């Protein structure tokens, strides 16, 4: 559903529990590399509690097997994206998309 590849590596050792504050740096891009959001554009981190499900599944899942300082590839299923439906207008049907993701720290 989600399969993850290092761009720069972590401490190997700090991952997210569930509860806490994830915060990251991401771009999210559609498969065919297109952004369509970006934290990042905006110069701010993004905050998700993990294990609330306010993040796509695949976002949630892929960051719980970072360690913080990491950045990544995540390839999302739309499995575990938008699923049949998408978001229309942004996210298309059965859409596979790709996060770059930097941990940055846990709260």
């Not at 590399?33 to 934290?39: A, E, I, L, T, V």
């Not at 990491?70 to 049949?84: E, F, H, M, N, V």
Request: charged share 25%; hydrophobic share 35%; net charge positive.
């Amino acid at each position: 559903g989600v399969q993850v590849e290092t761009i720069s590596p972590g401490d190997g050792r700090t991952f997210p529990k569930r509860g806490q504050t994830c915060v990251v740096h991401y771009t999210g891009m559609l498969e065919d590399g297109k952004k369509f959001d970006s934290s990042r554009d905006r110069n701010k981190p993004f905050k998700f509690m993990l294990g609330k499900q306010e993040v796509i599944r695949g976002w949630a899942e892929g960051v719980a097997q970072m360690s913080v300082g990491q950045r990544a590839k995540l390839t999302i299923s739309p499995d575990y994206a938008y699923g049949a439906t998408g978001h229309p207008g942004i996210i298309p049907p059965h859409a596979t998309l790709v996060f770059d993701v930097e941990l940055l720290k846990l709260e």
